[PDB]
């Protein structure tokens, strides 16, 4: 049951290389948990393009107190970390199955 801090040692380096231009796209391979009997590998894009399959829910607008750029720059590193954290945690469950 690892914590988000454990994956920060890799995620931060990946994002810093992405920001510096060393890496132009970023991917993950994780053991997707389909069922207790089937654990197929999965590929997911990490480049934070967008996640609107939820139809942007109500798509309500907000007043970005720190600003458009500041909110964007502070949410994208967190979003990929959450995606990595979920994928690693999903892999752990798939590993045990």
């Amino acid at each position: 049951a690892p914590k988000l801090e454990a994956i920060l040692g890799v995620a931060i380096s990946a994002i810093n290389g992405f920001q510096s231009g060393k890496y132009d796209e970023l991917y993950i391979i994780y053991s997707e948990f389909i069922n207790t009997l089937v654990q197929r590998p999965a590929i997911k894009q990490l480049l934070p393009v967008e996640s609107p399959d939820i139809s942007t829910t109500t798509n309500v607008d907000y007043t970005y107190e720190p600003g458009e750029e500041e909110v964007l720059n502070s949410i994208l590193p967190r979003y990929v970390e959450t995606q990595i954290y979920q994928a690693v945690l999903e892999s752990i469950a798939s590993e045990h199955s």
């Binding site: 988000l4 309500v60 907000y62 970005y64 107190e65 720190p66 500041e70 909110v71 502070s74």
Partner: protein, 69 residues
């Protein structure tokens, strides 16, 4: 009278009904009430306050975001 949800990357902390929120906003602390106008904001290392019928619980927030609707 607004549904508060404190969700963390590890677990959910609290999901009850709240009277008032004393959020530590980046530019300056703001109050959040039952029917506040839409908002989503970055937080900074600080000390958020939740008011329960006159009682204050320092849910100090190391940092994160807050979407108010």
């Amino acid at each position: 009278p607004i549904h508060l949800e404190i969700v963390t990357a590890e677990r959910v902390i609290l999901s009850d009904d709240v009277d008032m929120i004393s959020a530590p906003t980046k530019d300056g602390r703001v109050g959040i009430l039952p029917r506040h106008a839409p908002l989503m904001t970055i937080l900074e290392p600080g000390e958020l306050d939740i008011i329960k019928n006159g009682e204050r619980t320092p849910f100090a927030v190391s940092g994160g975001f807050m979407e108010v609707l």
